[PDB]
User: Which sequence fits this backbone?
């Protein structure tokens, strides 16, 4: 490795990077020449935004570093949406932002931007390379920052400097710390939490993504104190399945007795969650356990703050928590949960199989039953979040859920599916697309075709910005700009060389979805759904 | 108008705004409720990036304010590429960037970003609304800043504040200054330019977009001092046509004697240009006239700097410039121009009508001949810039050229054509698309269908990132990542409900293009072109 | 508390804030009206830069929240130097940056700046108040972010909004998490460190500020593996005293066998340090333990990275680390260290103690001997860092050292001393000032007089930018712009109403310093020191 471009790629290969998503051009050419000589695969995308989404999804699935790359000015500017999403999701992503020739910086040159400034909000590390040795340092610092969980890292590289001599290897020779530390709470904070639990007659646990490695501990605590368990959308994958305490979700796409259980308990314990809808949370007596102390109390009054890991905190407090024999609150909340879910099933199950346009809730129920027990589900922002949250389950805990749950951008599903599918072509990947989201990055159908990624793109084609239609109904606003003339995505996918099917009959949804999911290759399933569907 | 959302829309309609390009959602809903109750058309796009490009193109065509709007966080984040392009092009654009509810700012809320910080590099004005009266003020300042030529303006509006009471009208009642001032040069700088011209035995004029309102003055000066006229890409629309002094373009996509005339004249005069390729410009004896004094001397050694308008500077100096009777340099440069262009024709014009895959230069020649004399051409960044610069002409000066000439982003052609066509459906709009550029924002074919914009999308389908293929050949780099499996854009357009045709035979290009351009509706013409074809 | 200004001050008082350093004006007036009606003391400063340094120093001394406040535009702009210093030092500081009236934002008004953008690099949290309820939220998030160790927090408050209605109390009622969690390492990283230690025949420990709560563990590990212990400047306060393995410091102001021990050991272990001078560190076999994974390998090749707390990591690995019986390396390094220190004392003690102009090393030795065992020492950036590092010791560990060790700004000593002294007027505070540093913020002598803070300002008056004189000598540059005509700081302090003494005779330094340190009130000691004493 004589040039900085070669040293950068060799360092990524030695770190286990297998693929780089991007689109070649100008200042990125020396870097793509180094990827050509390496054993890293170059994954060409139609729009660099999709490369940043794909890298973020690959990272969420592998737990390892993922990389995207883009040319100068407008090239790396397209990464921004996907970098905000990957950053909010805590993905381990390195973005290679090629930059204009260093001699032209400051001269308002052709394509000039300041990415080293622009990307400061959507990254935990973002610096510009000014030479070989310094480039080697900031590449190490970028990788180490993202592997430590600080979010996206961006390395800005002027094209001429990528062709200059590499550094001496001092920083590229380092081992990267990528382990997960065990964060025990401060004994004083743990004691206050023990006191709050023992003195509450009824407790509710509200779990988020932070309980990922604490399932056994959360269930063990819930059994001891007879607490209903609710979950934020980010914790659904980990705590909803095989859980006899489950009371659902809160917020506008919530369901069941979670809102009641959270607001009626003597004590609410927020476990690894940053659920932002304050109006749904109580203020009277709340505890919060979070690994990042700065996140505690962001969403409601917290009287018992605990900086610590969920599993380690529960292991620390369990011997001091007295077993509660009064289950009346848990039983009352489980009955309320069942009564709410049964009222929906009793009212709507009878005529859903005959309703035209197809009910998206019926599609999601079938998708849950037909998809593999270890499938990856990617979820487009919009009404697909409602269908995923209420109908897609994770029995056996081997399914992965990837979405724009925090940044909330449309169009993530197909590019997320491209990244997730690239990890293992023998694993089923289902993209729950919206017609709005798919239309927004439609050219990524050409990426699916080019790389023959055998993902299953299920389009909930309601010819509408469905979620906006719902917002306007809630606000009392006459609908405007949300519904438009129908689009045939099955014909568009067929024209792009992808196997497709158009589903319009509710009586054929199950069989046609089954055949499409069994097809050994990419498939687009265009389902004509009701834009006004809601239970 | 009780709410700030209604006051904002009423202010835009009083300014003559006819359309807003965008995609509705969350915090933008109160604003679109006001647009619903107004004269303004709501133009739904598939990706907000296309709304920012469309607004920029509409503004370049009308010379008036154009508006784009987007929802909070990820919605307005998508405007960024189009805002950089509109800003670099000097478009008069207002971007309505809806923002998260004000009570959630600073709480790392769902969809939270800081657009009021993010858009500072791609705008001349960018501020956040925090109340009704203050919102009315910054709406005025944003419009006034962009109408005065300071580039894009961004107004960031938290959704809840759009529903609050409007201001009292003090700033919305103002007349906006949109006139063009006449910037005469400092007499000392003009005197130095007069002296430099009279002492030079030979002069060359190199013109850019700044000569837009100075054609008569530039030609009058060129006739008096017998100076060849070359041009930067941004000035091509204005000075190339009906010009007996024309010696072409400079830079890598240049042609003709422009580089010789610029480097051999006793004095080179840069007129309204910021041509960035320094290696092609002389350093010895250069004058520069620019309306923005900060731009002077950015690209080469300038000995005679002049802060001033091109037309006003030329009118100021003309009575003091002595007529040059010696035409030798002009004639020698016009002959050099012809010798350079004839060497290309002698080498490459051999069986072009039979070359397979179709030669893109042949397609561009035919497009130049068949398109209307007042057509709008939008140009995708890449090899289409080469075909546009060398083969699309502007006889009569009634054609408009819109492209990403300064920001250099791919995928601008179709969204620019959507904005340009929306101005007047009876005017022909031709989009010169690249397969890479069209694939990058492919969903905007659904926007063309939805609004039935009768534009003609000509896809130079070379199954390649053509320009990158050329860069790698020049740098001595083995080709990689540029060429990919073929895509049928005609079938994709047909599936999207747009009339289309696929052209693979060079003997049918002329007739099939003629039929497509005559069709009264949107058409996509997918032309399979040679990725290796180039006349050097 | 009806207004947001009152709610803000009530929230700070409920958090235990006793003082606010600042300078009143325009948009800050409603806030100082609320301070007037509270138990919080208002500490008027001459320059808002000093208020930010004072808050940072108070926080480093108490381990609790400290607050500074400034008026709109130019007022809060003056905080910036002190906020960079407090941020780099990890101080727990809240800066109240008053802002122009909200109706004028975006109109290029009189005094308009964008502090909510300007202060992003010198803070972990920086947001603008736009209403009562939102102001209450961001005040909580700012306090919680700084109390969790994320650095300075800035709250930007338009003056008119400070007078508007307060929020409902939801976020102000929260308990703030200020505990210290116990971070155990990932077992795989700890196992690699155990293997590296057991395979090394000789080990050296290089400690920084991160070993503050790990003294016992560091000494315990050092005894087991017979390792010399060196330290970075930030760790001097904690690991230098009562340490039989001590081999000094590294870098240009270093001394003793630290550089030799670090570079000759088979394994170097970086413990809680971010020492930036890479040229003094080895590259061949280095381990690093840091609580922030992003900091690992920033300064040299790290082969054994460990994300974890120093004390918890050592407790975790100790039972697996074999006792090293070979003491040869330790004894060789301790003999080298002792010979280096004793040789200097034997050779120079007489010339330094009698030298005219007074030798600054003699002044620092006297200060070490005469100052209380629990004194606070503040250190001005420049040659005073050399005198502090080499001669001020911390026997019993009850002294505090405050300086601009990371941001490296001049003029911090007197403002740091004002903050440290304000905590407890019965505790001795010694400010080691430079003539350049004191002259830079000379008006703060009026603050010392106004508040009668009984600190002892020792001016090392060498009529020079001493450290710059040394830089130019090392670079081979002819001296220029460093030395200027003598200033009489004792006469200036006397004119400002402060008790002062001018010391020019080395035979009187000890006696006159003893009298000055015993004086019950503020004292400025102007010592004419040798400008050619460059260590
Ligand atoms: C259209 C749309 C609508 C939405 N509607 C809703 C809705 O109605 N209901 C809903 O529930 N969601 C909703 N969401 C998502 C919502 O905005 C939030 O993103 C989500 O609820 C947060 O999930 P979380 O708390 O699991 O994850 P995060 O917000 O990522 O929080 C995880 C937290 O755990 C902490 N943590 C991580 N590891 C550990 C550890 N080991 N120990 C302790 N703490 C740790 C992190 O620091 C963080 O604070 C919606 C999303 C979309 C796109
Ligand atoms: C792929 C690609 C390749 C390119 N290759 C080339 C190439 O080889 N050759 C080439 O020519 N271009 C090339 N371009 C474009 C090139 O980068 C520049 O953007 C362009 O040449 C600048 O044109 P301009 O000077 O007319 O406009 P601008 O750069 O916009 O400059 C116009 C100037 O006029 C000034 N001005 C405005 N109004 C007035 C007035 N009334 N009076 C006086 N001054 C005024 C402005 O302040 C400004 O400084 C390329 C573009 C692309 C996309
Ligand atoms: C004029 C001047 C000259 C200087 N010259 C020198 C010189 O020659 N020599 C020198 O030594 N210094 C010198 N300094 C200071 C030097 O620049 C550094 O600031 C200093 O050496 C860093 O000290 P540190 O590593 O202890 O602290 P920091 O740089 O603050 O690093 C402490 C580290 O410990 C980590 N940490 C914190 N808590 C824990 C925990 N519980 N467990 C594990 N890790 C934890 C932190 O994450 C951080 O990485 C100079 C300063 C000045 C002003
Ligand atoms: C980039 C972007 N633009 C706009 C929005 C606002 N928004 C959120 S959901 C939604 C509608 C999504 O439509 P579609 O993808 O068809 O999903 P549906 O709700 O109809 O299932 C919109 C406009 C957004 N989140 N991201
Ligand atoms: C958003 C963006 N990404 C990348 C580039 C770099 N780039 C400039 S031209 C080009 C190739 C364009 O391909 P296509 O649109 O097919 O045009 P062609 O040159 O093949 O005619 C590329 C990759 C860019 N300018 N903008
Ligand atoms: C604000 C600031 N300006 C400049 C410097 C550069 N600098 C570092 S130390 C120093 C000299 C300090 O002089 P003085 O305070 O008299 O201390 P001395 O070295 O003479 O003891 C200078 C100029 C700095 N660190 N901070
Ligand atoms: Mg939809
Ligand atoms: Mg192409
Ligand atoms: Mg000095």
Assistant:
């Amino acid at each position: 490795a004589h040039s900085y471009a070669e040293q950068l790629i060799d360092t990524l290969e030695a770190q286990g990077v297998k693929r780089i998503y991007g689109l070649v051009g100008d200042s990125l050419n020396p870097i793509v020449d180094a990827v050509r000589q390496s054993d890293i695969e170059w994954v060409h995308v139609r729009n660099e935004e999709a490369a940043a989404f794909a890298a973020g999804a690959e990272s969420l699935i592998t737990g390892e570093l993922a990389v995207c790359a883009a040319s100068c000015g407008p090239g790396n500017t397209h990464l921004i949406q996907g970098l905000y999403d990957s950053h909010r999701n805590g993905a381990k992503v390195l973005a290679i932002a090629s930059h204009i020739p260093s001699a032209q910086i400051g001269s308002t040159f052709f394509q000039e931007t300041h990415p080293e400034i622009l990307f400061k909000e959507c990254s935990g590390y973002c610096e510009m390379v000014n030479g070989g040795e310094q480039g080697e340092r900031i590449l190490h610092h970028a990788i180490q920052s993202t592997m430590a969980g600080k979010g996206v890292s961006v390395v800005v590289i002027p094209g001429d400097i990528a062709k200059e001599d590499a550094g001496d290897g001092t920083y590229s020779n380092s081992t990267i710390s990528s382990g997960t530390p065990v964060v025990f709470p401060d004994p004083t904070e743990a004691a206050a939490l023990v006191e709050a639990i023992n003195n509450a007659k009824s407790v509710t646990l509200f779990c988020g993504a932070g309980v990922k490695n604490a399932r056994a501990q959360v269930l063990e605590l819930a059994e001891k104190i007879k607490s209903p368990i609710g979950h934020a959308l980010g914790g659904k994958q980990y705590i909803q399945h095989e859980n006899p305490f489950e009371v659902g979700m809160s917020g506008l796409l919530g369901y069941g007795a979670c809102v009641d259980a959270s607001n009626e308990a003597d004590l609410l314990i927020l476990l690894g969650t940053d659920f932002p809808y304050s109006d749904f949370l109580p203020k009277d007596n709340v505890a919060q356990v979070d690994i990042n102390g700065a996140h505690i109390g962001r969403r409601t009054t917290v009287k018992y703050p605990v900086t610590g890991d969920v599993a380690a905190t529960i292991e620390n407090i369990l011997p001091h928590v007295k077993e509660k024999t009064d289950r009346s609150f848990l039983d009352r909340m489980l009955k309320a949960h069942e009564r709410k879910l049964s009222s929906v099933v009793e009212t709507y199950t009878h005529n859903v199989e005959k309703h035209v346009p197809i009910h998206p809730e019926y599609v999601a129920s079938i998708l849950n039953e037909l998809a593999d027990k270890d499938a990856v589900f990617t979820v487009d922002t919009g009404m697909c979040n409602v269908w995923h949250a209420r109908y897609i389950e994770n029995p056996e805990g081997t399914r992965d859920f990837v979405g724009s749950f925090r940044h909330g951008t449309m169009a993530n599903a197909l590019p997320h599916a491209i990244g997730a599918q690239s990890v293992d072509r023998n694993r089923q990947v289902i993209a729950m697309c919206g017609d709005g989201g798919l239309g927004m990055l439609l050219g990524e159908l050409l990426t699916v075709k080019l790389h023959q990624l055998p993902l299953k793109a299920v389009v909930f084609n309601n010819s509408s910005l469905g979620m906006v239609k719902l917002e306007m109904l809630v606000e009392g606003q006459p609908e405007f700009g949300t519904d438009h003339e129908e689009v045939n995505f099955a014909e568009i996918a067929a024209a792009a060389g992808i196997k497709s099917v158009r589903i319009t009959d509710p009586k054929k949804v199950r069989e046609q979805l089954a055949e499409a999911l069994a097809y050994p290759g990419p498939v687009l399933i265009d389902i004509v759904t009701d834009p006004n569907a809601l239970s």
Observations:
- The radius of gyration of chain C is 24 Å.
- Chain C touches chain B through 17 residues (CB under 8 Å).
